[PDB]
Design a protein around this ligand. Structure first.
Ligand code: NAG
Length: 210
């Protein structure tokens, strides 16, 4: 289901208890849970430019192909987990199968960012199967076409999934996924299955009966 751990990262810079930033962070996470109920994505800014007094900027993105109640469950789990693995971080991100949660002290909302956050290539490689690679190419090409939300793609026994985070413009979503696919090709050349997660999007492919 939608709750297994994919990756997490925290800022090296830590905040101290009983500061405005701690308060702002709590308020943010509380808002994320509230917003969960009836939106799959939302953006937030709490507070004022500063550091202990700093503003918080953040967002969450649930898998767009999942129900309301499932998005809330995932986000509640996410708020608990991100606190657990990143106790006193000024910045943190967390990707579960079902949802993504991010906050920082800098205003990253809406800005393109294609930096690599996480990737995994399957240990099993396909060899002597040109057809597999052509089908992968067709799938990845279709994923790259995404402008809003998510795409599921399929060609033969090759399946793919891509998602843009809801703070991106269409043009920026296309560019982000273009970089994802480039990365899938260049880091995981021969893998039967791989995933690449950038700052503002991700893309995965896998073999079905492979
Ligand atoms: C934050 O407060 C400072 C004064 O300390 C002010 O210069 C600035 O305009 C404010 N910005 C926001 C976003 O409230």
């Amino acid at each position: 289901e939608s709750h297994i751990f994919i990756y997490g990262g925290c800022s090296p810079e830590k905040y101290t208890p009983n500061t405005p930033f701690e308060s702002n962070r709590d308020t943010f996470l509380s808002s994320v849970v509230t917003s969960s109920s009836d939106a799959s994505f939302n953006s937030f800014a709490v507070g004022n430019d500063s550091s202990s007094s700093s503003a918080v900027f953040g967002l969450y993105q649930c898998r767009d192909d999942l129900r309301s109640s499932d998005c809330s469950k995932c986000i509640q789990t996410s708020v608990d987990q991100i606190t657990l693995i990143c106790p006193y971080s000024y910045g943190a991100s967390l990707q579960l199968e079902g949802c993504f949660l991010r906050y920082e002290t800098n205003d990253f909302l809406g800005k393109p960012d294609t930096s690599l956050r996480y990737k995994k290539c399957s240990s099993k490689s396909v060899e002597n199967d040109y057809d597999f690679f052509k089908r992968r190419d067709d799938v990845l090409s279709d994923l790259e076409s995404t402008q809003l939300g998510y795409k599921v793609s399929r060609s033969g026994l090759v399946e793919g999934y891509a998602q843009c985070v809801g703070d991106l413009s269409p043009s920026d979503c296309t560019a982000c996924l273009a970089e994802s696919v480039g990365k899938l090709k260049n880091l995981c050349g021969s893998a039967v299955a791989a995933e690449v997660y950038l700052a503002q999007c991700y893309a995965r492919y896998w073999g079905s009966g492979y």
